[PDB]
Every structure is written in C-alpha cells, then in structure tokens.
C-alpha cells in the first residue's frame, strides 16, 4: 500500500568528492497513516551487497503520511575521494511503519553505481596568500638589503 520514487537532481553521475542529492517520494495508497522513520544510504560490494563498504548518516524523518497523500524527502551525501573509480552497489532504504507499529522497509534504489575520480589543479589563491605573507617579509628583506648595501659601501 506504499509507493516510492527516487530522483537524482544533482550528482547523477556520482562524482568523487562531490555532493550527490536525490529526492525520495513516498505515496500512501493505504487507509492508515504511514510513519516514515528514516532514510538510509549505503555502499555495497557489487559482487556481494551484504558486505557494507560505507554507511552514510541515517536521516530520521518521523513524518506521518495520511492515506491518499504524498510526501517527498531530500537526502544528500558526498562520495569519498579514494573510493572513486570503483563500482559500488547503492542500497537506499525508506523506513515506514503502520499505526499498529508493524515496520515495512522498501529499497527505493538498489543498483550498482559508477563513481568517477576528479583531480584538482594547483590553486593560485594559495600562492596569493603565500605571496602576501612573503611581501610582509619582503619589506624586511628590502630594509636588510639597504642595510647590507650601506655596509658594503
């Protein structure tokens, strides 16, 4: 009596060290109030999903969905840099419970994920920080150069 949908809005290609954000929609076709507890995402071994690789922080929701009503949830995570370049099975689970308290878990996304490494080139702003400091010292360098010139003369 529960229908779920997932839509990746950012990071659909799962870039390494980049934010991946997807929307999970919960639709209540039952006659009772569904209580969405938490949304969990984890990376699994492509050859064996039972072995966990990295568990992302669970997002407790605790949102009540009245019958014949739809609810949307937003989740985001950042893939680790060293882990890029390897297929990772992605298990995303939405936890919802009956008014009776029976708990039913649905996997919104259960597919292997390809992760792409990203490399960042030398930054000129760090060099600019360094050179402003080096000029703070270079005023001293110029003063000492004048002193040395006077000594030599």
């Amino acid at each position: 009596s529960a229908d779920t949908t997932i839509l990746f809005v950012k990071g659909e290609d799962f870039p390494a060290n980049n934010i991946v954000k997807f929307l999970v929609g919960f639709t209540n076709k039952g006659t009772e109030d569904f209580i969405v507890e938490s949304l969990d995402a984890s990376f699994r071994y492509p050859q064996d999903y039972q072995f966990y690789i990295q568990n992302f922080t669970a997002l407790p929701l605790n949102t009540v969905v009245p019958p014949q009503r739809q609810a949307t949830f937003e989740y985001s995570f950042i893939p680790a840099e060293p882990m890029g370049g390897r297929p990772f099975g992605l298990v995303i689970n939405l936890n919802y419970k009956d008014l009776n308290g029976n708990v039913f878990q649905d996997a919104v996304f259960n597919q292997t994920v390809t992760i792409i490494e990203r490399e960042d080139g030398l930054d000129g702003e760090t060099i600019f920080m360094y050179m402003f400091l080096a000029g703070l010292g270079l005023l001293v360098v110029v003063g000492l150069h004048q002193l040395l010139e006077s000594r030599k003369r």
Partner: protein
C-alpha cells in the same frame, strides 16, 4: 501519468530574528505525462510569527512538462525567536487529463532553531565603536612615551 516530487528547503544558513528567511520550493515532474493544474499551498507560516517580505505562499501552475521542474521562492521574516517546525506544504495536481486530483506533500525541513536577534548579534555583530573607544583608551599609555621619545629625537640628537 504525471508524478510530482516537491521539495521544500531553506536557503539560509541560520534562522535569525528580524532577518529575511528565504524559502525555496522545487517541483519535479518525474512522470511520463505533464502535470495539470498544479497548485502549491503552504499554510504553515502564521502571520503572527512570520512576516511576508516577498513572494506568495499559495501558487498555481497550469501545466508542468514531464522531466521538467519549476522553482518557487518566498522570503519571510520571523517575528518571534525560538524553535519552529517547518512542516511540509500541500501540492495538488492532475496527473492525467480529467483524472483524479492527486494530493502530495513537499519535503519537510523539520524543526529549526530561530536565533534571537540579540543572540545572533552577540555571536556575529561587528565591534567598531568599542574598537574606536578601546583604541583611544590605549592611546595615552602608548603615545605619551612615544611623544616623549620624539622629544628626545628633536631636542638634541640633531
């Protein structure tokens, strides 16, 4: 049929009393058909606690194309500090022509702590008039010896 995913998010790092609060509503049509007569209503902000600076909380769109999204933002100004629960909004649309009206809720940011303007100022306000006053206070003990030193230069080192 059209299937709409509506997300309600806050575009502010922190909630500050007396400062504009930015609310952004994003509706994504993931269904194969375009959503018709899409109406967004957010009655979770009473006028006694939040003042509307810009935007309208209740909106309507004649049609949302499939695989397309619409962005709506509203700027609010909290009038009382404390804890506030940002509940989800109500979205109504027709998934198919002449079809039943589908009622859905947007993403709920959850409980958020609105920082009192006084506390926010104490945590982030810039000190400039105290900075001038401090500086003036230090001026004597540092300069009077400095002026006496210049008196040394200028009486008999020439």
């Amino acid at each position: 049929g059209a299937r709409l995913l509506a997300s309600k998010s806050l575009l502010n790092r922190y909630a500050v009393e007396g400062r504009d609060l930015t609310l952004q509503y994003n509706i994504y049509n993931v269904g194969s058909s375009a959503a018709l007569d899409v109406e967004l209503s957010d009655d979770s902000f009473p006028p006694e606690d939040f003042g509307i600076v810009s935007g309208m909380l209740n909106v309507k769109w004649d049609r949302i194309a499939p695989a397309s999204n619409v962005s709506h933002t509203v700027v609010l100004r909290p009038l009382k500090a404390g804890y506030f629960n940002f509940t989800s909004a109500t979205v109504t649309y027709l998934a198919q022509e002449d079809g039943p009206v589908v009622i859905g809720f947007t993403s709920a940011p959850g409980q958020g702590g609105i920082l009192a303007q006084r506390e926010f100022d104490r945590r982030f306000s810039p000190h400039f008039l105290d900075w001038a006053a401090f500086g003036v206070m230090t001026l004597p003990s540092i300069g009077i010896p400095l002026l006496l030193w210049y008196s040394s230069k200028r009486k008999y080192d020439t």
